[model samples]
Each structure stands twice: as C-alpha cells, then as structure tokens.
Target: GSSGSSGMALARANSPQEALLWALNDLEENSFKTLKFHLRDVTQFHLARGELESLSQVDLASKLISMYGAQEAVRVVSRSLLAMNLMELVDYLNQVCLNDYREIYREHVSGPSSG
Candidate 1:
C-alpha cells in the first residue's frame, strides 16, 4: 500500500486565519493597498511598518497571526478595516473571515496542489 496523494496533508487554517487569508486572497488591489496602510495602527506603528510594508499580503497576514494568534489577529484586522472605513472589506470579514472560513478550508484544500 503506497501512501501518496491520499495524504496530501497541507496545513490549512481551519480557523479564523483561514478565512482571513482566503478573504485577503480575494482582495482587490486598491482595497488591499489601503488595508495595509491602516494596518500600521493595528500593528501599533512599530518598526514593523517598513518591514511589514514590504511583505506580501500573505506575509503581512502572517504577521497578523504571529503578533496575535489567528483569533486576535482577525479582530485586530477588524480594527484596521474600521480605521480605514472599508465597509466592503469589513463586510468581507463579517461574511467571510469572521463568518465562514471553514467553507473554503474544506473547498480549496481538496484541490490538487502537489505533484
């Protein structure tokens, strides 16, 4: 019994970060741009500004997770959206990130990503 494709086992976030990541992944260029800018406050305007400024969206999201666990990260993310007044992005978090990340976690994780 050769075990291969059946155990793809890629670590997918079944938690808030999953949906947050999934939502962030769907971000429009402008939306994400502003979101990152406002993120400076949520991240406390620390030296993480320049370093975080250069990170990929996912990288910044990773910073969100590291600074605060996925649970707190999303809330802090909510703080950024509120500061920027991005209702659309906030709604995305409500309907997607804060609402249902598991749907995607189950959906995309099923795709064939490895060889």
Candidate 2:
C-alpha cells in the first residue's frame, strides 16, 4: 500500500538516550499518546535503554504537572508549590492532571506532583 506523504514524520535519535531526550523535549502533555505509539510499547510505556529511550506516560504526566501545574489553583492543600507568572497553567493542570488523570492514569491521582 502506498503510505502517502504524512506531514508529521516520527523523528527519533539514533540512540535510545537521544530518542528519550527527543521525546521529552518534543512531546507535550496533550500530544503524548499521538507520538507514543510510534516509539513506545503499547503495553509498557517504559522506553528501555536500547529501546526508544522515552519518558513513560507517567513521567510525561509528571512533567506536565511541573511545567503546567506547581501552584496557584490548588495551593494550601495541593502538593505542588512552585510559582509561575502565569495563572492559567495551574487551572489547566487541575482539570487535566488532578481531575482527569484517573481516566488516563497519570503519576499522581489526587495531589499534585509529589516531587
């Protein structure tokens, strides 16, 4: 079958570590799944050393919390405490990471990123 021109081509590094770094640097919270299937094992999200070397879904979720969450919305009771100039980042994290994380199975279910 002809694999027509797919504008989005999966780009991975020659080495697993490089691929992992690429995944970490390129993949975002909302688009992790889209790119995961190409480089990760469906059953196990872990990218082995020699494998693709990518962050696990859980790790991706955590980074989302760190980059998006951290503080403002769920402060006082929330685990995250870092502060960012932006306010919406906290809200998005709440709705996505705190609330809907269960549907997706992220790192933490209730509290924000533990560490």
Candidate 3:
C-alpha cells in the first residue's frame, strides 16, 4: 500500500505457491522484530528471503519454528535452477554465463602445466 499515486501492486494467493509468495512479500516489507510479532503464536507460516536472514539469529529462529506448521524449521529457495551442490551448481552457471570467470582463467593459462 505505497502512497504513490499509482499505488502498489497487490498479488493474491489462489494456490499454495502463491500463498508462500505472499508470505515472502510480507517478510520483505516488515522488519525482523515486526515479523516475529506478526507470527507470534501462529502455528503455520512460510519463510521468505528476509526471514532467511532473520533465521541466522537464535531468538528469531525459535520464533520462526513456532510460526510454521508442525513445528518446522525455516528453509530458503534459491533463484538458481541448478542443484544445491556447490561444485555442480557453479559448473552449470559457468556454462551459461556469456563471460564466465572460470573460462577466462582457463584461456589465460596454458594447459599441461604442473599441478
């Protein structure tokens, strides 16, 4: 609900994915403390990017678990489509990047060099 004349865009949730997205937007808009208050005593909530940072704190994490269904811990979803493994993910990313750093390094260095 921004004060701009055009106003803010509102996205509604008709599915679980959409609901989770809405929950994420709430976390981004409010501060960690305010978010904790909003979920206080709630038994089911979702995690968002802002909440990922909030989870790094002990007090916030405790509240986060309590704020979810079945007492679950907070989890974040990455933007990349690659698998979670760092090595594989990095390789996949380099494959697609137009100007990948790894490729540049390989090009600058000669092959068949000592380990």
Candidate 4:
C-alpha cells in the first residue's frame, strides 16, 4: 500500500530479482546501519576485482565467522550480497556454480601459494 514514485518503481520492477535490488537500494539509502557496517569489508573485496573469485560461498562465510563469529558472519554475507547489483549477485545463493566468487575470496585469504 505504499505510495509515490519509488513505490511505483518497486511495483514495476519486472522481476523479483529487480525488485530485490530496488528494495535493497532503498534500505541502504535509509541509513540501514547494521547492513552497512556488516558488509563494509565485503563490499571492499567486491570492488577490488578478482578478490572473491576464488572463494566458495561457504568458505567466505567461514572466514567471516572466524573474524566476527557465527552471528556476524550471517549478517555479513547477507549484506555483502545485498551490496552487489542484482545481475552480479543473482547466483550468490547457489551452493555451487561454474564460476563462484567465493573462490576468489579463498585465494586472497588463503594466499596464492597455499592452494
């Protein structure tokens, strides 16, 4: 029952994925503090290019867990994916893919020489 141009856009987003992007954009713009802070470093990794190309999704979560613990890890991953544009993050929910971003994170975190 929301009204206004923004609400209209949400209604006409064409797909659930597009609507999700719009919703997340609105949330981020609305001073969603917890989301912003949780994904801060993960966003940095995404921007760095090739940074998360090696990590598996689970691996990325595990790393976050190690640094921030189980509870925070969930938030970080959720926020991190939300931080990405819809097209870029569509497959993030998948357990496996031919090209997963988690591998890239793994490479950087585990060190190039390690595995």
Candidate 5:
C-alpha cells in the first residue's frame, strides 16, 4: 500500500476525472454507459464533498490515491465526475477554490506533532 512516485503518477493518470475525460475524448459518442456507471457509483469515491468540490484536477487525483488506494481512487473519482451532466462536470472540474489541501488530515494537523 505504499505510494511510490510511479504509483502516484499512474493513479493520477487513471483517476476518475482523467479517466472519464479520456473515455469521453476517445469514445465521444460511445461514452454514455461508462459515464453513466461512474455517476451511479459516485458515493464510493472517498473525498469529502467540499474537498472534492474545491481541489484542482491534479490535487483531487492525488487526494483520491492517498485516501482510497490508487486503483479504487481512480475508479471512484471517474465515476463521481461521470455522475454529473457534461456541462456540470466540466464546470465543476474547472472551478477554483483556494483552500485545497494535499492530504485530508493535513487540515487538522498542526506543526510536527507525533502521532
């Protein structure tokens, strides 16, 4: 379960948002079922609603892998995005929020506290 650099890169590449976009881009007219299933499984994705809403695509992808493990993170993120309509999904992905945190627990942690 250790997240090496390559695993992290692969996860980001395969994350739901990236994967869905790839499917949409590649299949174009044929992406409906894949996209629909993603939406249907939206709740399985791990990020908090606010976290998911606020992060950039890359940050979100990283967060997913760190929280859910790389493979499942990819699956859920793609599905979460697919659950939305095209315009809604695109706009959501493109929206900006300044409070993005790379780790879920980082928000709660203060400087250098040992667990």
Candidate 6:
C-alpha cells in the first residue's frame, strides 16, 4: 500500500478528460461558475453570459472534448486554470498526461499576427 500505484491510476485515468475533471474539482471555491470568468467571451466560448450558472463541471469537460479534442481541451483547461492562478492542476496535466506548457507557449507566439 505504500507504493499506491493502483489507487493513483484508477482514481483518475491518465487522459485529458480525467485531468480536466481533477482541475475543475480543485479550482477555488464556487469554481463551477467560474469557467466563463476565465474564458471571457473573446474566445467566443459562448455560454450566453449566464448559462454556466446551470451547467455542471462534467458538462464543461465533455463540451471541451466535443469541440477541442483531448489535447486541445487539456490546453484550454490548463491554460484557463493558470489564468485563474491555479497551478496544481497544471501539475496534474503535465505529470499524468505529459502535456508540456513550453510547446503551448511557443504555439501561441507564432508570427504575432495583427500586432
């Protein structure tokens, strides 16, 4: 039981979906409705301003996967989370899924359009 590998992997599968759920649950208090606060409409993340009030965290995860695939969803989740000043979940995404923030940062810096 000291190694604890079984419970670690089973409690949350090593997927972006799993990582997003962990992040969502770990956000600051009253975090459920805060998704929009991070996404902030310019991304056109589209919650009609207050629909997030009714949606559950799981719905956000599924919605992310539906539109963005596992990897991008992981980016969206972790990216928004970092914006929210939540660092631990990024650790989960990087550790479990091996997603790298360095690549994401460079990808966003490409060409500097409209500057």
Clashing residue pairs, candidate 2? Answer: 20-53
- Counting clashing residue pairs in each candidate, in order, gives 0, 1, 0, 12, 4, 0
lDDT (10s digit) by residue, model 2, range 1-115? 8654643325523432333334344446644444444433322445567544354644644443354443321232122212212232333233322233434455654666573
Best-first order by TM-score: 6, 1, 5, 4, 3, 2
Q: Please state the error at residue 58 of candidate 6 in Å.
A: 1.0
TM-score to native of every candidate shown? 0.59, 0.20, 0.23, 0.29, 0.30, 0.59
lDDT of each: 0.64, 0.38, 0.36, 0.43, 0.45, 0.62
**Candidate closest to the true structure, highest TM-score:** 6
Per-residue lDDT tens digits of candidate 4, residues 9-46?
22353333333333334545433444444454664545
How close to the true structure is residue 72 of candidate 4, measured as C-alpha lDDT?
A: 45
Q: Model 2 residue 25 lDDT?
A: 48
Worst 10 residues of 5 by lDDT: 3-12
Q: How do the residues 2-71 of candidate 6 rate in per-residue lDDT, one tens digit apiece?
A: 4334323334664567876766666656564665566654246567656655556677677777876777
Which candidate do you rate higher for lDDT, 1 or 2?
1
lDDT winner between 2 and 5, please give it. Answer: 5
Tens digit per residue, CA lDDT, model 5, 60-115:
45555576554465445444554454544343333311224566654575654476
TM-score of 1: 0.59
Which of the two candidates, 4 or 5, achieves a greater TM-score against the reference? 5
Q: Which runs of model 2 end up more than 4 angstroms from their true locations?
A: 1-14, 33-41, 44-115
Worst lDDT run of 10 residues, candidate 6, spans: 1-10
Write the number of the candidate with greater TM-score, choosing between 2 and 6: 6
Candidate 3 global lDDT: 0.36
The digit string of per-residue lDDT tens for model 1 on 9-110 reads 233455777766775776679888877667666666564636766877688678778877776666676667777676655654554344345564456754
lDDT accuracy of residue 95 in candidate 1: 47
lDDT of 3 at 110: 48
| Candidate 6 clash pair list | none
Candidate 3 residue-wise lDDT at 108: 58
